[PDB]
């Protein structure tokens, strides 16, 4: 809201409200998936494809093997979301997920080789699975 | 640089030398007929089989004696052998990794 209020006409498109917001809420307000996707756009500075990839991996895992999961879901992601914050192996879990799975497939190479994308981008959406 | 391009050139020269040893270099004999093309191709895959023999040997061809066999085999046939000879002694270890890539060029096949 403060961001919108010569180069400030459409600056809200980027809306980089990740710097000051995340540092304060580290210790006190840490006490989930409500804010999981919030940092996704900041990491890049493409989304639905990763969601399907993660869903297929878990479905395949349970197929081969063939009420409190929400609390376990919140804790599991927090263990790796916090470590993803500090990063400001990452090619290992996606390696299995892709193996579980073509113009958009060509675009993966150009959207993954960037160091910034390697450091913090690809390791967010897949966490929603397990 | 000149190193890599000369390595590729000598690899191609070795391929052509193997083709000449196998049969005549006149490829117009090979082309122009489905039967002649097929027999030339079959000779190509038997050369490819020899290439697989060389490659599977290459993994166990690092240190000393297989190194002698590899230096016996290359059939470099180069114009000015002084530079090519002297340039390969200094890089004792990485030449294996580059020459296996060069021997991957022994695959014209069909």
């Amino acid at each position: 809201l403060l961001n919108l209020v010569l180069a400030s006409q459409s600056w809200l498109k980027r809306h980089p409200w990740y710097g000051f917001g995340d540092l304060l809420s580290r210790i006190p307000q840490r006490w989930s998936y409500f804010s999981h996707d919030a940092r996704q756009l900041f990491t890049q500075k493409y989304a639905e494809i990763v969601y399907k990839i993660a869903q297929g991996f878990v479905l395949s895992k349970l197929s081969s093997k063939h009420p409190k999961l929400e609390r376990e879901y919140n804790d599991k992601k927090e263990k790796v979301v916090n470590e993803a914050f500090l990063a400001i192996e990452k090619q290992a879990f996606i390696d299995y997920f892709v193996s579980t799975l073509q113009d958009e497939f060509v675009d993966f190479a150009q959207k993954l080789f960037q160091d910034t994308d390697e450091i913090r981008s690809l390791t967010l959406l897949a966490l929603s699975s397990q | 640089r000149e190193y890599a391009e000369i390595v590729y050139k000598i690899a191609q020269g070795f391929v052509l030398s193997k083709l000449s040893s196998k049969h005549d270099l006149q490829w117009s004999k090979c082309k122009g007929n489905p039967k002649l093309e097929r027999e030339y191709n079959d000779k190509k895959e038997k050369v490819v089989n020899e290439a697989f023999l060389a490659i599977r040997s290459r993994t166990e061809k690092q240190a000393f004696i297989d190194y002698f066999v590899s230096t016996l085999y290359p059939h470099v046939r180069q114009d000015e052998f002084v530079d090519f000879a002297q340039k390969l002694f200094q890089d004792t270890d990485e030449i294996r990794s580059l020459t296996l890539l060069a021997l991957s060029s022994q695959y014209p096949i069909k």
Binding site: K79, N82, E83, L86 | -
Partner: protein, 299 residues
């Protein structure tokens, strides 16, 4: 009248300063961003505490100590038994309130604030690290005996790295009140720095000096790259110290002292500095510090 300052380093070993406040499953140490890389940091407060502890050790009068018998961090001797008549390094500590021993005016005529004679800076590493390295494990509970009752069954891991690091420090010369036996003890204790870390039962890092450069002319600091990288053993200012006395005279080489490993690597240029006046090439840092203390306070 004769200011001084030095920079010291230590031998390589696994890291020790494990802050470990990140979260339950990790133990993250402090980091700094240098030229796009991450480097380890040790705050000056740890060194101040270690110097205080060693001043305790050498049988020197003191006005502060810990108790380790309270729910949270606490220090008792700092303010309880002391009128702040004479601190450890003449710090003469302070605290602000509506009144403090009748504003410490009538009973003991001292300034409300403090002195802060000693100076120090941050300690920074020399080479970066590469993410998590070590694993860990924790026991379940006290088991049969019901006294711990953690009910954790946890399994975590911490972070370690291998690096030697260096830091500078300074000291003014015009402060010469009650100097002859107070400050020289501190300078002698600078040579030890054993227990300065955040844990020793598993790390055991020692700040043993390896090389020292501890002199310039009687003026203010020239700032000749006080954070000298030392190139993991070398020194980047050999060219800036050769011209001991010549037409250019672009460097005072008559006031310098060199540490151990910078002289152990014998060379002809080492003899060139030896014949050059004021080099004073030494081999044992502790006797170098003793000689500096003798020639700076008494002389």
């Amino acid at each position: 009248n004769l200011n001084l300052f030095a920079t010291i380093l230590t031998y390589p070993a696994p890291a020790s300063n494990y802050r470990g406040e990140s979260e339950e499953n990790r133990s993250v140490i402090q980091k700094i961003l240098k030229d796009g890389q991450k480097y380890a940091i040790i705050s000056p407060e740890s060194m101040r505490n270690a110097l205080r502890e060693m001043l305790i050790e050498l049988g020197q009068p003191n006005n502060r100590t810990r108790l380790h018998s309270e729910d949270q961090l606490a220090v008792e001797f700092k303010e309880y038994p002391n009128p702040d008549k004479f601190a450890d390094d003449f710090l003469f500590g302070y605290m602000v309130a509506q009144t403090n021993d009748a504003k410490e005016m009538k009973k003991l005529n001292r300034p409300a604030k403090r002195d802060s004679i000693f100076r120090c800076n941050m300690a920074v590493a020399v080479n970066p690290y590469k993410y998590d390295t070590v694993f860990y494990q924790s026991p379940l509970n006290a088991g049969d005996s019901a006294w711990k009752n953690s009910t954790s069954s946890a399994l975590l891991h911490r972070e370690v790295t291998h690096t030697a690091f260096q830091y500078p420090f300074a000291l003014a010369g015009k402060d010469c009140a009650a100097k002859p036996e107070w400050v020289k003890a501190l300078l002698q204790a600078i040579a030890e720095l054993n227990g300065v870390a955040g844990g020793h039962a598993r790390a055991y890092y020692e700040f043993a000096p390896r090389s020292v450069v501890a002199r310039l002319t009687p003026k203010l600091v020239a700032g000749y790259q006080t954070y000298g990288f030392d190139a993991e053993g070398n020194w980047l200012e050999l060219s800036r110290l050769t011209a001991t006395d010549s037409d250019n005279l672009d460097l005072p080489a008559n006031e310098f002292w060199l540490g151990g490993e910078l002289v152990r690597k014998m060379d002809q240029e080492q003899k060139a500095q030896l014949e050059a006046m004021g080099a004073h090439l030494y081999a044992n840092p502790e006797k170098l510090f003793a000689d500096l203390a003798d020639s700076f306070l008494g002389v």
